[PDB]
């Protein structure tokens, strides 16, 4: 875990899904999703898509283990939605690291 960088908080963005059911679900549940990302240092990646991919998996893993020792279950709808917003968040983090 000393191998990761833990970024500072950012505002969680709004994601849109193509139905009002999901847009609403998202908006109503999003406070339960993370607002900072874990990443490996920039100097290990030769490009953005690879940085982002790793950031998503690691961030999601840490968030799922730390809230499950707090009696929070995430459904498959939840992880699918975290996939999407952590992705945007990791991209923003990538931009923070490139000036």
């Amino acid at each position, epitope marked *: 875990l000393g191998v990761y960088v833990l970024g500072s908080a950012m505002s969680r963005p709004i994601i*849109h899904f193509g*139905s*009002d*059911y999901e847009d609403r679900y998202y908006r109503e549940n999003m406070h339960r999703y993370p607002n900072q990302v874990y990443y490996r240092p920039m100097d290990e990646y030769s490009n953005q898509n690879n940085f982002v991919h790793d950031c998503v998996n690691i961030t999601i893993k840490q968030h799922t283990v730390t809230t499950t020792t707090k009696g929070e279950n995430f459904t498959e709808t939840d992880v699918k939605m975290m996939e999407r917003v952590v992705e945007q968040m990791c991209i923003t983090q990538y931009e923070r690291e490139s000036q």
Partner: antibody
Amino acid sequence: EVQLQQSGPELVKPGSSVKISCKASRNTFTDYNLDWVKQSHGKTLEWIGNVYPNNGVTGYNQKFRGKATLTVDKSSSTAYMELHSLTSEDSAVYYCALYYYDVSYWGQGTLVTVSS
Amino acid sequence: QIVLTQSPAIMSASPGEKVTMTCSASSSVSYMHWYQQKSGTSPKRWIYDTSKLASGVPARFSGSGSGTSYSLTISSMEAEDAATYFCHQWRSNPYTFGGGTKLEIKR
């Protein structure tokens, strides 16, 4: 195939409280949403709040905070709405409504009469 | 919050007539939902996500709009369609309903 049974009509004294139920009878979904809605004098519709029965998350209309409390019994698929401190403005029909993507179902409603 | 105004409030149409009723919003919404209520029964979702029909809803119904302006159209008025129709938004809390359009048929 899913059906929402709501509990039956209630006559309550002003100042009292009452709890009504809505159970999802045949349901197979994981994440669905349940809205609670009030209709006054068979006309005007108001959103009270919701719950995702599985697990936890609960939203209120600010106007009904302190008036309604929403909970869920997940082992028996039953959602509850507690109404606190009834006055005559609380007499109405109260609906629960299930949503899951394209599908929606309303319960048949619960008539609450607040009267001495 | 977001105030939904429906018009007209009460309308009469004859059979076979094209009918249009409008719901407009004080600020933008992404999608609109419409509900039918016949007297004595509970509301039933009729069109969701602006223009998709709920199950059991006849083909002659349709929906459209964007921004602050939405409509429900019946291509060809039938006796069974006489009811009250409400629009509804899920854009922000509190979710709100319009005041209804009461639709009657001429005979």
